[PDB]
């Protein structure tokens, strides 16, 4: 299972937010994780990358990974999902399937300045 928290959150312009994902009840080894955002009113998600305002943290031992976004603006509103990547999926078809398992999402609204 991939447990994503929080489920929904509102923030003010200029605040930071953190989203967490943990892989529970799995034999797989976490290598890394990826993040995506769908803007409000769209179906289509696109990737986010570590760098600048975006700070990613991976904890292999706890099988968790997290995204912090600093200096939020209304442009950061949307629904975010995480996606884990297993370390040894090439050897284990169950863990290869982990690479396609997304968190349940976080619906984020950032209030105007
Ligand atoms: Cl694995």
Mapping DSSP onto H, E and C, the string for 16-70 reads: CEEEEEEECCCCCCEEEEEEEEECCCCCCCEEECCECCEEEEEECCCCEEEEEEC
Complete domains list, the chain, with CATH: 1-113 (2.60.40.10)
Residue 70: which residues within 8 A CB-CB, separation 6 or more?
16, 53, 54, 55
- Tokens found for residue 5: 């928290």
Cα 53 from Cα 7, distance rounded (Å): 21
Distance 64 CA to ligand 1 centre (A): 14
Experimental method: X-ray
Are the C-beta atoms of 25 and 1 separated by less than 8 Å?
A: yes
Q: Are 30 and 61 in contact (CB under 8 A)?
A: no
Q: How far is the CA of 111 from the centre of ligand 1 (A)?
A: 40
**CA–centroid distance, residue 93 to ligand 1 (Å):** 9
Spacing, Cα 28 to ligand 1 middle (Å): 4
Q: What's the CA-to-centroid distance between 84 and ligand 1, angstroms? A: 11
Given resolution (angstroms): 1.4
Structure tokens at 74: 């209304």
């Amino acid at each position: 299972r991939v447990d994503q928290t929080p489920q929904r959150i509102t923030k003010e312009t200029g605040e930071s937010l953190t989203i967490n994902c943990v892989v529970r009840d799995s034999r797989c080894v976490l290598s890394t994780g990826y993040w995506y955002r769908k803007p409000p009113g769209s179906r289509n998600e696109e990737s986010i990358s570590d760098g600048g305002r975006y700070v990613e943290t991976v904890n292999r031992g706890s099988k968790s990974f997290s995204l912090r976004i600093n200096d939020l603006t209304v442009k950061d509103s949307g629904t975010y999902r995480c996606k884990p990547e297993s370390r040894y999926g090439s050897y284990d078809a169950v863990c290869a399937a982990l690479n396609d398992q997304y968190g349940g999402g976080t619906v984020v609204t950032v209030n105007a300045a």
